[PDB]
Design a protein around this ligand. Sequence first.
Ligand SMILES: CC(C)CN(C[C@@H](O)[C@H](Cc1ccccc1)NC(=O)O[C@H]1CCOC1)S(=O)(=O)c1ccc(N)cc1
Ligand SMILES: [Cl-]
Ligand SMILES: [Cl-]
Ligand SMILES: [Cl-]
Ligand code: NA
Lengths: 99, 99
Amino acid sequence: PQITLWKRPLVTIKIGGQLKEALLDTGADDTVIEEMSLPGRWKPKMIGGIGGFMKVRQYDQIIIEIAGHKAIGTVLVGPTPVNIIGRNLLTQIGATLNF
Amino acid sequence: PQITLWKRPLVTIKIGGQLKEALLDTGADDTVIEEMSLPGRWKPKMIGGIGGFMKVRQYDQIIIEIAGHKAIGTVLVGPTPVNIIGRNLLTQIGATLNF
Ligand SMILES: CC(C)CN(C[C@@H](O)[C@H](Cc1ccccc1)NC(=O)O[C@H]1CCOC1)S(=O)(=O)c1ccc(N)cc1
Ligand SMILES: [Cl-]
Ligand SMILES: [Cl-]
Ligand SMILES: [Cl-]
Ligand code: NA
């Protein structure tokens, strides 16, 4: 698709068999999901945003579908205000910004 | 242009006579610039994201040139570590996210 930006660019994602809403965020280096169960071991990571830094759980090689496009990569889990799809997975679904 | 997302999507902007580097950010509702003076009236606002909230000054009807494209709208000013062009101005330059 071609998504305009008059409203938030919200899409459906599928992760761990569950459907969730997430924001396509070109200003986010990384993908961050609200609290949920994911398989495997996690690693620590600190990420920075508008309010400061915060700690998250880093899970690697997680299968995730984004607006129907399949991705497999790193998902951060933590107390984010909205689910965020960042550049690490936007590149995998072939997303570009155009003007 | 078409901008890929392997790297942060940074462009040059001109605001208040000043050249700055800014991130094209589909996850940001409004444009947020590092501390600088701007003309006219302002009112305070709180914006939220990763790490919590930041207090900003909201200036309306400000012109920015974004990669050569003029746009007018609200600009938030505060202690952001990165200048952010949000949806309110991305729409005006006809930016879309494509995949
Ligand atoms: C969290 C989203 C919903 C909203 N933010 C935009 C995001 O693109 C934000 C932009 C940013 C980059 C670097 C440092 C500081 C901020 N990146 C972000 O947090 O990257 C983290 C998440 C994972 O990867 C790393 S915002 O900055 O809070 C914000 C909120 C309101 C307005 N009006 C403007 C900006
Ligand atoms: Cl990844
Ligand atoms: Cl505006
Ligand atoms: Cl349009
Ligand atoms: Na004004």
